[PDB]
Design a protein around this ligand. Sequence first.
Ligand SMILES: [K+]
Length: 141
Amino acid sequence: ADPNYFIGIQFRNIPYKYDVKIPHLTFGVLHISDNMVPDVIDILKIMKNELFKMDITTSYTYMLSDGIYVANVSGVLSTYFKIYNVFYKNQITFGQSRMFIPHITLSFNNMRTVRIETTKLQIKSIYLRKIKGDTVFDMVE
Ligand SMILES: [K+]
């Protein structure tokens, strides 16, 4: 019953240098059977307006753990609560193991904090992907 799917968000802009291929926010983590993907997609579609209304911002980078350098993310709390609650009610396992500490990993290196003026991260797309697997759904505004 290990986490096996993520809901990710990719962005039009990232105001920091980074070494990862494509920076993303892991917004949510799921444990599901593959045949539940349509149901998860249905919920993502129902919540599409709400998700794309999020005002995601960033203002500094930091070390989250040894060798994990990340950008902070703000603006996703209330929407996280809503989607958490919808999945919970629907008996779809979501956010049962993942700490809520929104961040975007930038590099696997020990690096100093950079601070910028608060910057909005424009959402490029929101997707559902198998952990260490393929993206099975992607939506744009
Ligand atoms: K807990």
